[PDB]
Amino acid sequence: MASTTRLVNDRKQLEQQVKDDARILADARGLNITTVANDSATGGQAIRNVG
Amino acid sequence: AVEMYVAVRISRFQLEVLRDLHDLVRSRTYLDVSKSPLATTPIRVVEYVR
């Protein structure tokens, strides 16, 4: 049990830190939403009256 | 002159006489589409959502 047994955990922590500090410097820009539309209807059979 | 010695006549007649010009207005009934519109589709069961 030496400093070599901590290598995998060291890599786990290093990957977490790399992701975290690459998220900080990444530039973020808003995007335009162009998908709004009322196209989600439902079908079926009409309940026609009889008489 | 264009009538014979025997005359054909009418015993009764009916007509409406109005003394005021504002008596010519009457009323009728209509559905209010804005608040009670006419239905355009029948009631159906839910199937084939897409």
Determine if residue B48 is left, alpha or beta; phi over 0 gives left, psi from -120 to 50 gives alpha, anything else beta.
left
- A47 Cβ neighbours under 8 A, 6+ residues apart: B42, B43, B44, B45
Contact B42 A48 (CB under 8 A): yes
Experimental method: cryo-EM
Tally C-beta pairs within 8 A across A and B. 27
Dihedral (CA of B8, B14, B15, B19) sign? positive
Could you tell me if B29 and A25 are in contact, meaning their C-beta atoms sit under 8 angstroms apart? no
Contact A44 B45 (CB under 8 A): yes
Dihedral (CA of B29, B34, B39, B44) sign? negative
**Looking at the complex, does the CB of residue A39 fall below 8 Å from at least one CB of chain B?**
no
- Resolution in A, one decimal? 3.1
Alpha-carbon gap, residue A49 to A40, rounded angstroms? 27
